[PDB]
């Protein structure tokens, strides 16, 4: 549904890199 952008909402698990 949504993208795991760094601060997707909490910015806890930043699945970015």
7 phi and psi, to 5 degrees?
Answer: -100, 70
Query: The tokens of 17 are what?
Result: 């890199």
Gaps in the chain with C–N over 2.5 Å, residue before each: none
* CA-atom Rg of the chain in angstroms: 7
Task: List the end-to-end C-alpha distance of the chain, in Å, as a whole number.
Answer: 20
């Amino acid at each position: 549904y949504a993208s795991p952008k760094c601060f997707r909402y909490p910015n806890g698990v930043l699945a970015c890199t």
